[PDB]
Amino acid sequence: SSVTLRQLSNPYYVNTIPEEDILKYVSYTLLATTSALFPFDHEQIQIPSKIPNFESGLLHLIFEAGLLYQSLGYKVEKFRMLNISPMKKALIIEISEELQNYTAFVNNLVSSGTVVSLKSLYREIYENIIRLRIYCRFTEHLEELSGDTFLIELNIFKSHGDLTIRKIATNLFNSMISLYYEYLMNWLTKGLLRATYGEFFIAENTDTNGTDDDFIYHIPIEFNQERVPAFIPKELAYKIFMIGKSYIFLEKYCKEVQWTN
């Protein structure tokens, strides 16, 4: 009579792990920590035999977030330890921001006590899985790529039909480009080329050859037109170059420091 279909099906799942136990250890896995129920290794999540294939399949999907989270966390540390362009850091920072948001999100759902089923869980976390998938793919080979390269790809993604893609591509771009802006300012107001790692089109000319090593005729600044980004019209890229070059000329050789300053 009053018995529900789940109650009727229960006798056949008596040897399996109940939903509560799953839910209790899933959140730990979602944050890429490990547990006795889900012996999560440095890479793989061991899935015990007491989880039926139906549930295993759903958990493969749910746990994707933990796996993606783990991967992103690892590269964040990889980069934290390296001396890299601040624009790469801008991306790293954004990754960390996303991971922090993820964390809050997961903890909210879990601590709310409103997740009573994996299906509900999956549906709620689904968007975050995607967001992580996006970062995970955008950060592939991050270390092999230059800051400009990412800005270019981001510009492409900023027009992508998917709205989450646009939000992420836009935000990542904004974070990085704001430092490009800073590089440009350093050049424009200080004549400064610093920590460019070759990502800035204006470079120190270190290719000396005896004649003029004292920079009497030449001021050691390169204008690499081929490295000028899409967002800087050629005319300005050159003008920018000449502004800083002039700054240097003036400050270094004419010594009109009070004015210059």
Place this chain on the structure above:
Amino acid sequence: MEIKEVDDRAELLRYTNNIPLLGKLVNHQPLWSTNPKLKSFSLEKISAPDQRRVQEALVVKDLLNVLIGLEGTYIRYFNDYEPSDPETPIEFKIAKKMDPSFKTFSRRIVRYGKQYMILTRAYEKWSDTSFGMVLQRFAYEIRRFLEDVYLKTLVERLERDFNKVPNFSIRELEQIINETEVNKQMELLYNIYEEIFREIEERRTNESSLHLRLMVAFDTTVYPVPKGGAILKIFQQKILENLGDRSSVMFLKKLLNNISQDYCTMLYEWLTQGILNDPYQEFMTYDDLERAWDTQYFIRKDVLLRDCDSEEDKNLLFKMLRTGILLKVVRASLQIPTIPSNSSDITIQEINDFADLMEGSNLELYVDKCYSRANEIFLKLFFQG
């Protein structure tokens, strides 16, 4: 039920070189057919009246999993299903020992599960940059549908009732699927998928304007993907197919209204600013030069909004091109990124609704206004400047 010892492992796929940007980046549970994990149950043991209700409970549990693309206890993936190769056909085996009333309901319900898996897979594929922009937005809309409606219903209404309703039955399950019209929406999306798909398979398989021309070529390349106007036309056709069904067309219109926003935005800027930015090649036109003044123009016949086998559409097409070209020249001459609203006193409103623009001779008047603005501004500068 007894448990077989199977060591499953969840892991990230190691290679993503051929994985769509939004596709799954993890492995999958082994199939029943290779690693059963549970001991088989014969069904017949519980087939008697008053045992049958349990069999039903077990069947419903399976359907709930089937509807999200998972196999169940008595419903198994098709033998040649290959989860590691997402081209694989989707089909299911129903335990033959199942009560025939259930076997019947199951086929009716599993069908939605098939659409689910396909649509899910399709939007993931469509995230690739090789796909058109409008299609990418469509893929987005599908994904949202599934989260907003499909699964919302499944999770909050149906699983919940399985767990809590004493008289829930497979009969109700079918009723719900239909009464909420979720299935209808699934079918409509599905049918769109099939139409697109078919069109793609065909794509994979296969002077009257001279007096008004400049250095322009007609690009007849047939793309593997029905980008731009080609997708938009499908939607128009689907509306025609659904005429008389108000719910269906409203649904379809909402989709069109959403997917077309970027296309019409791109169009707007071309027509009011002369600014065309089309990294996904959706637009009806493109030019050369990605000194550099010898601009060649191209007409992308395959993504046009109108086929232009009529005089009116040909005339419209060219006026539209000229509009944008005149504006481009002005921007180039003035070395301005944009032409302000404070120039010729013509206000051109944004396209808010693509379909509304396509409906009636709205393109003709909209474009005439756009054209006129381009023309007046152009003339002012050329004559007086």
Place this chain on the structure above:
Amino acid sequence: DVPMSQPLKEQEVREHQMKKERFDRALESKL
């Protein structure tokens, strides 16, 4: 029916346009 020519102005206008186009096309075909 009466074995008669269509109107003359139209015939001449067509000749003028065809001649103009013949000329224009001599050039459009390469230019």
